[PDB]
Nucleic acid binder design. Structure first.
Ligand SMILES: Cc1cn([C@H]2C[C@H](O)[C@@H](COP(=O)(O)OP(=O)(O)OP(=O)(O)O)O2)c(=O)[nH]c1=O
Ligand SMILES: [Ca+2]
Ligand SMILES: [Ca+2]
Ligand SMILES: [Ca+2]
Ligand SMILES: [Mg+2]
Length: 341
DNA sequence: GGGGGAAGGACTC
DNA sequence: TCAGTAGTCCTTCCCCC
């Protein structure tokens, strides 16, 4: 199997730069303003100019402004990024039927039936980068290897605006020299647990007692890491089918007053249904983000599709369940639909 | 024992 | 004073042949 992974460079910010060339060269920060107070919210992403001084995804907008008060701050316009993204994904389908869109700015192409070796794979990669640049003037990074995981690792190493191939030999090398925290799917929580086991490289997972590893990071993650260590990971590239559609919004102020939360909850339901398009969900979850930012969720699965009317009444039941089972104040409220017919 | 599922939370991105 | 809201897994409790 030969896999080619594509990840668009500093996507949200780059799109803004394509739509407004004068931004090129200046630090640009795409922001998610929450409305609670002046500059309240988080950074969605920033271009490399801004990222260079510590302004990156996730940090508070207020903090970004302390670091680069003169950077250009733009409100996130996800709809616009989504449409640009959709066009680029369509350019990708031309290179392979087997494509897995993993997020708004990345996808995997199984080009096994398209090239014969990495040399050709590399060229196809350059071809794809030129194509996207020509059509949308967007730079992306390509990663190529024997499976999805290493194709992604390949791209992470070559970004931004790059291209890299990790041949069979380098895969074996990485299984020994690569920091395990840099393996896709390993976050801070898991990385830390692994360090507490003396595990810092994929190969190390092979010298520990399975159940000990398992008992520490879960059966799935343990098996995942082990299969990679054994150079046995080979998950197929498959069409992604969205499994849930929802909306969660921050309220002007925290509260646990039903009548005061409802409007938001109902707004969330309205937007979610629009997104559902023609999909009919059999499950609904009311999601609350408490004042301390903990997440409390209560849902229900019905034997038949949920009409928007049922969604209204049922969501109110779930919200109250949360209210009676959690005394904290609610900061954000939303709904999430799944199990589509 | 294990197929099968619903529900709430953990972890990742 | 930290947005948003998807996709696995894991746990528990639980029905049932
Ligand atoms: C990470 C992260 C990304 N995003 C959005 C912003 C990004 O443009 C997009 C893709 O995430 P990356 O993870 O691919 O963000 P980036 O495109 O700016 O990437 P790079 O370092 O590869 O050049 O999704 C968030 O909104 N919040 C986040 O916490
Ligand atoms: Ca990405
Ligand atoms: Ca990217
Ligand atoms: Ca990591
Ligand atoms: Mg909690």
């Amino acid at each position: 199997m030969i896999v080619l992974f594509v990840d668009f460079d500093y996507f949200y910010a780059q799109v803004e730069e394509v739509l407004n060339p004068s931004l090129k060269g200046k630090p640009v920060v795409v922001c998610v303003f929450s409305g609670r107070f002046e500059d309240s919210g988080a950074v969605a992403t920033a271009n490399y100019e801004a990222r260079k001084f510590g302004v990156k995804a996730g940090i508070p907008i207020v903090e970004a402004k302390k670091i680069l008060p003169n950077a250009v701050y733009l409100p996130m316009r996800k709809e616009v990024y989504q449409q640009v993204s959709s066009r680029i994904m369509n350019l990708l389908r031309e290179y392979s039927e087997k494509i897995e869109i993993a997020s708004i700015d990345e996808a995997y192409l199984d080009i096994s039936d398209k090239v014969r070796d990495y040399r050709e794979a590399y060229n196809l990669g350059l071809e794809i980068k030129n194509k996207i640049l020509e059509k949308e003037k967007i730079t992306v990074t390509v990663g190529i290897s024997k499976n999805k995981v290493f194709a992604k690792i390949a791209a992470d190493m070559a970004k931004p605006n790059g291209i890299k191939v990790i041949d069979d030999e380098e895969v074996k090398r990485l299984i020994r020299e690569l920091d395990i925290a840099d393996v896709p799917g390993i976050g801070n929580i898991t990385a830390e647990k692994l360090k507490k086991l003396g595990i810092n490289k994929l190969v190390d997972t092979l010298s520990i007692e399975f159940d000990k590893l398992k008992g520490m990071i879960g059966e799935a993650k343990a098996k995942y890491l082990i299969s990679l260590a054994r150079d046995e990971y080979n998950e197929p590239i498959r069409t992604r089918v969205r499994k849930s559609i929802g909306r969660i919004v921050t309220m002007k102020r925290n509260s646990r007053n039903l009548e005061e939360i409802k409007p938001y909850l109902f707004r969330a339901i309205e937007e979610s249904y629009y997104k559902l398009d023609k999909r009919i969900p059999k499950a609904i979850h009311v999601v609350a983000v408490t004042e301390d930012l903990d997440i409390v969720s209560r849902g229900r699965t019905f034997p038949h599709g949920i009409s928007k009317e049922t969604a209204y009444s049922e969501s109110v039941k779930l919200l109250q369940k949360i209210l009676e089972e959690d005394e904290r104040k609610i900061r954000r409220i939303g709904v999430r639909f799944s199990k589509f017919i």
